[PDB]
Design a binder for this molecule. Structure first.
Ligand SMILES: CC[C@H](C)[C@H](N)C(=O)O
Ligand SMILES: CC[C@H](C)[C@H](N)C(=O)O
Ligand SMILES: [Fe+2]
Ligand SMILES: [Fe+2]
Lengths: 255, 260
């Protein structure tokens, strides 16, 4: 009869994880991506396009490997009797993934393309990558798809967490924290990409994907014993560090 | 370059799949569960309770192992380029799971409890198993939890499909075919449970779980996830196995309703 840790023990896990995120240099003030997105004067199409391709692959992998992690947990709950407080947290994960896979929240369903075109990595590909690709060469496009080492390392960690029953809680706990600052950074960068001196993105609804996200924006509820709690913090530490290294790679390329 | 098979080959897979469901004797007129549910004059609390406990465990495993199977497919899609037609079929699996996990379809959310109390195996436990359990002895309650062999075999197949990237497609293809007849069967069975001379289910709203399932299946493809001919053969083999085990588990229900 599986149950979550007592509340006060879960509050401690929340504080420890909020500290690891601090420690990983992911806050609006500490990560170079959020800073460069604000500081830099203009962005070349090739630089903006490369970051857009990297993000497409990162968010694709985030969605699918978080769903896989939820499935790993589902496999366990098929063979145990999770109590209703655990089941509620399990439902939350399913609901949150539904933003990226099916535009669940009204902030998304009103504006997103329907069907598969609305899946968030596809919607990003169609509305950010594609208009930038017209301003770059095929050789550039192929180069952008050879992902840099910090992005590759984060994707490798997502593949490992795809098999971990704690994996979806780890990924959503970290990503939900930094999501809004990422979205605001993108709103800024792609307003500053210029081609014939002129902005590539110059209408309102070319930012639909980004603005829907800024509008739109407990996981420890799935920890069932103190040991799994320790594993949760260990995994958050690894994953938060890899996310930070990947976002600094964004900042470096934008300069 | 990951794409569904051409529409001609998928239509052929669909026909082979319908034939496997026919051969498994899962149709309305074939399976002993639907027959017994229509024919029996009355159902004892102990017999109704046992079937409801077995059902609770079967539908709990169906939900979690189908979601696990979707996760196994997600593992593969994380590193491949599935085209938009595959992605659309993937979205559909996610949406359909949401009925049981989150009462996604409006027919369900209009009556279901909110939060985890609305998960379908939990809602069944609270509204069907619990009122029946008031009318059975402790010995009988413990016996009901000793699941019979055909039920255990089906749960084991569900565990095996939890790891299979085709597993969610296999389970939904079969269950969506038989869901209406199962729900109608339960409406008939639990309408005929009497304790003393009184109906155990004497108020319309006690049937809410069953009536919602009947409406959702009434008022309203998985082969689209098959990406080559070798996977198509595996899909048909898995459907044959899984449909056979579903039919045997339902035959076990029918036997319980007609026992000496
Ligand atoms: C990593 C996920 C981010 C924050 C966003 N939800 C997206 O669709 O890309
Ligand atoms: C096996 C699933 C059946 C058809 C129903 N959806 C339920 O919640 O039990
Ligand atoms: Fe998203
Ligand atoms: Fe259901």
């Amino acid at each position: 009869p599986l149950s979550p840790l007592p509340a006060v023990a879960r509050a401690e896990l929340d504080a420890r994880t909020e500290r690891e995120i601090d420690r990983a240099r992911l806050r609006r003030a500490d990560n170079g991506f959020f800073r460069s997105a604000r500081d830099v004067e203009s962005v070349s199409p090739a630089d903006g396009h490369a970051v857009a391709v990297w993000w497409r692959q990162m968010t694709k992998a985030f969605m699918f490997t978080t769903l896989a992690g939820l499935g790993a947990l589902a496999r366990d709950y098929a063979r145990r009797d999770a109590d209703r407080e655990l089941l509620g947290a399990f439902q939350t994960v399913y609901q949150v993934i539904g933003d990226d896979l099916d535009n669940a929240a009204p902030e998304f369903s009103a504006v997103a393309p329907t069907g598969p075109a609305g899946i968030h990595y596809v919607w990003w590909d169609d509305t950010i990558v594609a208009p930038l690709a017209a301003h770059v060469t095929e050789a550039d496009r192929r180069a952008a798809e050879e992902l840099p080492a910090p992005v590759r390392e984060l994707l490798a960690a997502m593949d490992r967490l795809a098999a971990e029953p704690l994996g979806s809680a780890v990924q959503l706990r970290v990503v939900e924290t930094i999501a809004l600052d990422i979205a605001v950074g993108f709103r800024r960068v792609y307003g500053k990409v210029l081609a014939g001196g002129e902005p590539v993105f110059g209408e309102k609804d070319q930012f639909a994907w980004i603005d829907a996200h800024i509008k739109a924006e407990g996981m420890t509820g799935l920890v069932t014993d103190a040991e799994r709690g320790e594993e949760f913090v260990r995994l958050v530490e690894e994953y938060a560090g890899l996310w930070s290294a990947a976002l600094e790679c964004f900042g470096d390329r934008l300069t």
